Amino acid sequence: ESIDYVSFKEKLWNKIIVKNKPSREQCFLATAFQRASEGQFFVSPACDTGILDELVKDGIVGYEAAGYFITHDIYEEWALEKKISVDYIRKANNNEFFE
Amino acid sequence: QEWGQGNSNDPKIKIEVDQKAYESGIEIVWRVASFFESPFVIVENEKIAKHFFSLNESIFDLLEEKRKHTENVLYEIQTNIEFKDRSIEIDRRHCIELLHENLVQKKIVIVSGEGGVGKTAVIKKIYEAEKQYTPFYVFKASEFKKDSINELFGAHGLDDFSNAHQDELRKVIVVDSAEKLLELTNIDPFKEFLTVLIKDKWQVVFTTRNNYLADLNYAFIDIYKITPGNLVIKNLERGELIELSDNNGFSLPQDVRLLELIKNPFYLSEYLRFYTGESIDYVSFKEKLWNKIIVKNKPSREQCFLATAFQRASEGQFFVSPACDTGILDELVKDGIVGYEAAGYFITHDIYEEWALEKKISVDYIRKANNNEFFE
Amino acid sequence: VKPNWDNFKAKFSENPQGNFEWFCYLLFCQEFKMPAGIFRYKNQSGIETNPITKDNEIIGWQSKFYDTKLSDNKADLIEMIEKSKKAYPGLSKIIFYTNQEWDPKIKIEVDQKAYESGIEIVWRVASFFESPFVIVENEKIAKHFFSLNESIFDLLEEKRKHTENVLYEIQT
Numbered sequence: 143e144s145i146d147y148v149s150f151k152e153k154l155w156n157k158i159i160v161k162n163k164p165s166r167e168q169c170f171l172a173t174a175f176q177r178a179s180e181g182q183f184f185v186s187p188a189c190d191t192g193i194l195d196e197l198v199k200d201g202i203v204g205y206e207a208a209g210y211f212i213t214h215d216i217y218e219e220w221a222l223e224k225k226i227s228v229d230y231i232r233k234a235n236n237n238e239f240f241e
Numbered sequence: 242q243e244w245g246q247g248n249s250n251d252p253k254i255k256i257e258v259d260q261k262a263y264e265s266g267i268e269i270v271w272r273v274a275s276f277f278e279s280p281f282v283i284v285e286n287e288k289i290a291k292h293f294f295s296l297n298e299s300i301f302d303l304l305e306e307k308r309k310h311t312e313n314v315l316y317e318i319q320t321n322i323e324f325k326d327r328s329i330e331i332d333r334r335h336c337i338e339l340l341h342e343n344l345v346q347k348k349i350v351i352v353s354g355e356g357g358v359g360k361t362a363v364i365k366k367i368y369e370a371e372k373q374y375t376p377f378y379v380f381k382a383s384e385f386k387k388d389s390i391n392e393l394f395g396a397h398g399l400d401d402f403s404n405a406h407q408d409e410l411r412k413v414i415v416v417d418s419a420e421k422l423l424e425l426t427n428i429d430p431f432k433e434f435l436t437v438l439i440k441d442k443w444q445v446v447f448t449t450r451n452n453y454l455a456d457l458n459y460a461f462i463d464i465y466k467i468t469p470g471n472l473v474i475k476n477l478e479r480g481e482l483i484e485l486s487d488n489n490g491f492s493l494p495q496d497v498r499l500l501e502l503i504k505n506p507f508y509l510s511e512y513l514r515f516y517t518g519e520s521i522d523y524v525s526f527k528e529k530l531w532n533k534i535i536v537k538n539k540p541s542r543e544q545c546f547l548a549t550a551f552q553r554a555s556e557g558q559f560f561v562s563p564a565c566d567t568g569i570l571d572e573l574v575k576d577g578i579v580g581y582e583a584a585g586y587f588i589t590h591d592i593y594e595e596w597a598l599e600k601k602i603s604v605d606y607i608r609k610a611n612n613n614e615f616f617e
Numbered sequence: 618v619k620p621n622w623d624n625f626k627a628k629f630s631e632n633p634q635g636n637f638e639w640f641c642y643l644l645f646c647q648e649f650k651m652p653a654g655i656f657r658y659k660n661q662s663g664i665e666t667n668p669i670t671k672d673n674e675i676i677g678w679q680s681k682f683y684d685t686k687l688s689d690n691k692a693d694l695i696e697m698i699e700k701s702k703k704a705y706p707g708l709s710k711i712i713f714y715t716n717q718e719w720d721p722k723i724k725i726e727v728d729q730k731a732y733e734s735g736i737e738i739v740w741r742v743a744s745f746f747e748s749p750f751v752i753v754e755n756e757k758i759a760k761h762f763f764s765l766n767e768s769i770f771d772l773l774e775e776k777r778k779h780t781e782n783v784l785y786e787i788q789t
């Protein structure tokens with residue numbers, strides 16, 4: 143009488159966002175964090191050649207002349223949680239992590 | 242041939258041979274040239290008749306061409322290591338029996354593991370046990386770069402080749418190095434290939450590295466509604482390598498980081514290529530591995546690898562984000578030298594990281610203005 | 618497919634008579650259910666093969682490809698009828714195939730020669746090849762003789778099976 147939620151989100155992240163390119167995953171994580179950090183709705187990220195245009199043709203990311211934005215709120219939440227996990231793995235101490 | 246008109250109209254030689262047949266207790270049924278002109282030969286059995294009456298290629302010729310291809314593909318594959326006039330084999334009979342069992346219970350099997358571990362040699366040992374009794378064909382994943390799948394089968398189609406085996410219950414196709422399918426810009430011919438094979442009830446085997454494993458499992462479960470069998474092949478354990486060393490008569494290296502390398506059968510095969518007088522010619526081994534594995538023929542590969550190793554050693558970090566040229570880390574990940582995870586990139590073997598730092602020190606020594614600047 | 622004798626004459630210009638005979642042999646074997654063929658002597662006289670037997674009636678066949686109307690050819694038919702009974706005394710029926718068309722007088726004359734011989738003649742003139750027995754039932758045989766580009770009908774099978782392969786993936 144319930145869904146297996148961790149399996150659902152794992153299949154969706156790998157199939158829709160990553161596909162099979164490491165550059166796509168690094169691009170999407172950077173894009174979500176810059177919005178959450180600067181407070182801006184539209185951003186212009188630093189990325190490898192063609193990755194943002196490819197994400198726009200997938201419909202995952204949207205574009206207007208002011209910059210790029212993320213189409214679905216659920217995917218932006220998943221991205222922020224994964225970025226926190228990465229910084230937890232790479233820390234020297236707790237005070238650095240919270241900075 | 243045909244008889245000439247002289248049954249009441251028969252010529253004398255025919256009634257003489259017919260008389261001797263009867264006197265021996267036998268009836269003869271005569272099938273002269275007008276038999277081969279009839280619907281039984283010409284319309285019903287046209288695929289057989291075309292072999293003998295035509296100078297064009299035929300279905301027998303197609304099966305011959307594909308068998309030749311299978312023998313050519315497996316020629317280079319090595320199944321043992323040869324050393325001081327003696328042959329060394331790792332026992333694989335457990336894995337081979339598991340594969341025979343899976344093919345009875347299930348339609349599709351995936352064989353998986355890291356590079357150089359022996360996935361294709363197992364397939365070679367299956368083939369040598371079955372080539373006479375059963376249809377068995379091997380295709381490289383490189384071959385599906387075509388506009389149409391029928392380009393692989395000459396003037397015949399895929400459906401013709403499949404129909405030639407319709408009376409066989411056991412029949413196998415192997416797709417080899419499946420992770421190279423990620424290099425194709427058009428995947429539509431391969432999907433049609435699988436659709437025909439699933440409909441006609443072939444058994445199918447894949448060999449793959451670990452990066453493409455989930456994609457294969459998803460595709461069979463989502464589209465064709467099949468749960469495939471999975472098998473994993475691994476490097477040696479330390480006790481197994483000790484017994485190899487004792488039984489076959491070679492001494493193991495003293496360096497812990499080299500001992501971790503030769504647990505993989507490809508690298509053990511290289512180690513025993515430079516061995517003489519109960520020691521190894523270490524300089525030649527080092528030179529061959531650096532130039533053939535890491536550099537190949539690109540300067541940009543060597544520059545990227547040196548920068549990655551030094552960044553790890555400088556920052557005190559296992560995972561890093563290197564500032565490489567725009568496609569080189571992906572090429573090194575496909576080679577299996579560099580690894581990737583969501584936290585960053587890392588280096589797979591320790592011995593290569595030591596060698597990288599030593600070359601970096603040599604370069605900084607060549608370029609220095611004075612000794613204090615070098616140590617800084 | 619549709620009957621076209623210009624296509625036939627363009628395809629089989631090195632030997633028209635010999636290919637028309639084979640077209641009739643295949644249709645005869647289909648009509649009288651003799652799928653493994655019939656015995657035949659070299660330079661066989663009167664009729665094209667040895668006779669068959671069915672419900673106590675004995676039957677043979679003959680074919681002719683002509684540029685003339687049949688009225689010009691009466692002597693061949695009289696010769697056919699007389700030369701057959703000389704060789705196969707019990708013969709009851711002959712079936713005759715041709716690309717031509719003729720009720721007219723000459724048919725009555727040749728029928729009388731057959732009648733006095735006691736032999737029945739059945740005529741398969743050009744309108745026979747307009748029949749659905751040729752065109753619709755035995756279509757695979759008819760396609761060989763009347764089509765300039767018979768391989769086009771394989772292409773119309775290849776695209777059809779391609780379409781079935783494409784839609785197998787789709788879930789409703």
Ligand SMILES: Nc1ncnc2c1ncn2[C@@H]1O[C@H](COP(=O)(O)OP(=O)(O)OP(=O)(O)O)[C@@H](O)[C@H]1O
Nearest residue numbers: 319321330331356357358359360361362506507510
């Ligand atoms: N049973 C065995 N005993 C000893 N050495 C073996 C054995 N099987 C394989 N090897 C060695 O391992 C090497 C690599 O084998 P193989 O080509 O099958 O690897 P693989 O797993 O298919 O690799 P790849 O992923 O690169 O295609 C062989 O060239 C041979 O030297």
Ligand SMILES: [Mg+2]
Nearest residue numbers: 360361418448
């Ligand atoms: Mg291999």
